[PDB]
Design a protein around this ligand. Sequence first.
Ligand SMILES: CC(C)(C)S(=O)(=O)c1ccc2nccc(Nc3[nH]nc4ccc(F)cc34)c2c1
Ligand SMILES: CC(C)(C)S(=O)(=O)c1ccc2nccc(Nc3[nH]nc4ccc(F)cc34)c2c1
Lengths: 277, 281
Amino acid sequence: AICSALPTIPYHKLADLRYLSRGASGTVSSARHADWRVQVAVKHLLLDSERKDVLREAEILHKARFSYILPILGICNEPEFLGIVTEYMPNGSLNELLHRKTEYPDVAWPLRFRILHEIALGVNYLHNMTPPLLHHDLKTQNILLDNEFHVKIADFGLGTIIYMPPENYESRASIKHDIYSYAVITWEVLSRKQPFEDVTNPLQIMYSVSQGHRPVINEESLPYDIPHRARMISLIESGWAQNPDERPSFLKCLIELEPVLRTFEEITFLEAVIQLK
Amino acid sequence: EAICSALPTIPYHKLADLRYLSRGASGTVSSARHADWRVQVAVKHLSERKDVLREAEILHKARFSYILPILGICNEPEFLGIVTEYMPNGSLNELLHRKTEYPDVAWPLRFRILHEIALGVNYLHNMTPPLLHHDLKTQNILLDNEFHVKIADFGLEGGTIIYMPPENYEPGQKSRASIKHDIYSYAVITWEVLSRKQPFEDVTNPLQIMYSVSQGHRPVINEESLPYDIPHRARMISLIESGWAQNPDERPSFLKCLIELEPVLRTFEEITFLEAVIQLK
Ligand SMILES: CC(C)(C)S(=O)(=O)c1ccc2nccc(Nc3[nH]nc4ccc(F)cc34)c2c1
Ligand SMILES: CC(C)(C)S(=O)(=O)c1ccc2nccc(Nc3[nH]nc4ccc(F)cc34)c2c1
């Protein structure tokens, strides 16, 4: 019986508003809060219904507060400006980390596994809310990284189709969507390759997928020296199975990952991160 | 007008591996793991019922980057308790005073910690209505996996007196509403952080301390406790001295302290923070 209101932030309290990116849900800018003295992120798109969406997103971030979910700091709601304010993630997205190879030549295994564990922890948290909250748009672009490269998931429960399960083409009630996305992401994290790299059309991907084809698993995509290779391959293969019923819950997924994570000393995570600086 | 988040209720039986950590004024604290969420957690437990409920409500309302995150509440016939994220690195107190376990504590880490305590307390003060700590000490500044600060036990056997401003020695409606209590505590903490020494180490009589403190005395700001090599020494000593001023109206706000601290922090390269943590492992 304990409630908490989301702070309202006066637009005039946000200084140095610089453009970061624009996307389907709005434009994201970095700023600083004049009173709290911290860097923040601001998201802004006004139609009669376009308002109910921004407010629903903010309500979602506020209810889904957890260690691996992007923390919301407050709603900026005035007659002039309408925006969401959250912590600022200084390390970008998992997509950048995996694919900017000149900037990041080495991403050590312990850090890759910690990221995979945290993405699962975050999604598992969502699924355990009452009522259950489904992500449905999980991708490397919205898995964000904080100052120590810990995961904060964003843009859930509200572009690219490589993370979308086949049954989702021709559904909104499916609890086996997220795990599908997760299998692809896992493949992507362990290989640092773009899923279906030889495809010149999104439709060609969607076609292959509907026919049961998946990102390639072989020695070139996943070298034999990858720690716990066999176990990860099983997890990936069951996660993206054509038949949703054969896909594991996140509970099962976490239970499989726990013994893998225990094999890594806490200092190896710190060393992996400092290597990136 | 506003959007509302309900604090989750956590069944006690959902907590596995419950182990004892410590017994504090407000209750027993234990570590555990949540069976469904698969994360480690801390659990605080003991009609002295609406006291637990109030602490929970406060933690829930004061959610912020430098405040201990609450995950849910345990409210059952048998058991009452609060559940929060587990802090793997203890308290600031153990960091400063366990010199064997922690031979070095690099300046950049010390300054980030000071900067974070300030951001935390400042945030409380800026809520509406302003929320005041009044028992800020090194024992309840908690440290996360990468030594970032999370402040606990605000707005709520007796403890230490060294962080208490003289005027509060005999409490009333005047001092319980004082918006200059926390800054005094912060000043002492700032001194304790920069020196790794117990304030009033010489005096081993807590009551004697209270007299000395009432007379104007503060911890020893000499060369012996605060070496000349301390980064931005002059600027820090100035911050401390004005923070623990015998007169409440001569004490600065936290927003004021932050604005001075900002330039100091910018002088340390990011890499040094990570280097400080690896050295502590
Ligand atoms: C993604 C990128 C790395 C290309 S970015 O440079 O655009 C970037 C960087 C840093 C961020 N830090 C925090 C939050 C970001 N975005 C958001 N996703 N969902 C949001 C909902 C509300 C909100 F206020 C911000 C939201 C960030 C975006
Ligand atoms: C202090 C120590 C380092 C000697 S400890 O070993 O007791 C310790 C270790 C780790 C912790 N992690 C988190 C929170 C702790 N304590 C708490 N303060 N306020 C709380 C309110 C609710 C709650 F659930 C826990 C709370 C911790 C305490």
